[PDB]
């Protein structure tokens, strides 16, 4: 009776389309936010503090052409992947603190084998494990299709650690970052439109790196205006500054909770 069933959003790489991918990212955003908290037109993610554990997580079920299924657990507060589940085994990133350690105990309670990596899920660490930086790692339906397969086979013993790290960077950007950023989502749609694999450019990468900063700048903003500008990059890697909220609205879909409204 007890174990909590978290919302499940299904997506499959098999015969995937721009439409079905857009529908996927919207459903994920739908589950991550009620949309109850909005500052400057941007939906805010639920406050981690005081958050009941039944509202804490959502599940992403991934399927590919190979007919393999892999389930990801996403933290509703940061919209980030805390770990995943394949068959009878579950795997979790090393938690950043004892409360998060406690939280993930409510996940994947029906698996036989439960594992916690010695490493966390941040890009830097994941990049060291993969042996490749995000700028050298391709994104698209192909890679995601490949990432799904590698996640599944890791229990098998059929996936090398670097490959597993590579697949995480793939999954995380193509799902979490897509959900956080309409722009990033838009960059993934473009890969699907053209059936291309491409590693993300500086414009995408600095969005990922600045996400926390932007949420803060937006929530602390005075009538939309920043105290200090934030530097971002054009697709060509050239810098440019954002002094205010209006410019970010088409860009960032979700904000981490910083201050109360």
């Amino acid at each position, epitope marked *: 009776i007890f174990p909590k069933q978290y919302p499940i959003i299904n997506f499959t790489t098999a015969g995937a389309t721009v439409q079905s991918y857009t529908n996927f990212i919207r459903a994920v955003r739908g589950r991550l936010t009620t949309g109850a908290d909005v500052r400057h037109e941007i939906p805010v993610l639920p406050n981690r503090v005081g958050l009941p554990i039944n509202q804490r997580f959502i599940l992403v079920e991934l399927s590919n052409h190979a007919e393999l299924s892999v389930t990801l657990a996403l933290d509703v507060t940061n919209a980030y992947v805390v770990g995943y589940r394949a068959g009878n085994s579950a795997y979790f990133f*090393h938690p950043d603190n004892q409360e998060d*350690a406690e939280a993930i105990t409510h996940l994947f309670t029906d698996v036989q084998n439960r594992y*916690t990596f010695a490493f966390g899920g941040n890009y830097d660490r994941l990049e060291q494990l993969a042996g490749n930086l995000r700028e050298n790692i391709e994104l698209g339906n192909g890679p995601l299709e490949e990432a799904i397969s590698a996640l599944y086979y890791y229990s098998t013993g059929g996936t090398q650690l670097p490959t597993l790290a590579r697949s995480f960077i793939i999954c995380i950007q193509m799902i979490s970052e897509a959900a956080r950023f309409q722009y990033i989502e838009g960059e993934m749609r473009t890969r699907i439109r053209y059936n291309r694999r491409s590693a993300p450019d500086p414009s995408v990468i600095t969005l990922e790196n600045s996400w926390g900063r932007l949420s803060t700048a937006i929530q602390e903003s005075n009538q939309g205006a920043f105290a200090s500008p934030i530097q971002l990059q054009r697709r060509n890697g050239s810098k440019f500054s954002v002094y205010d909220v209006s410019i970010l609205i088409p860009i960032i879909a979700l904000m981490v909770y910083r201050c109360a409204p």
Partner: nanobody
Amino acid sequence: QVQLVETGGGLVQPGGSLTLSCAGSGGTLEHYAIGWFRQAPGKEHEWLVCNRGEYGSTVYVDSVKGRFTASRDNAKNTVYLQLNSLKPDDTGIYYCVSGCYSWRGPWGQGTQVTVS
């Protein structure tokens, strides 16, 4: 499939030492974190150590800090917990799992430690 078997449990006297072994079988635990928990009668499981890598530094709960020591022999594929200066309140069954600071999931038989 990697699994863990605890060993080293015994009966000890106050101030004594003991050495527990968490042995992996069907693969490397090298990149897995390994926690140690203990349960005492009429009491809930409590977390003792978090051993990461290699990788991260090793975390101890304050009460066992400097008393208890974790180490790894890679290729022996085992995580050790060396218990030192044991008190009767260190009594209980000791479990090793891959996880830290909080656990439900299977333990595990554990290996018994009695200090009298």
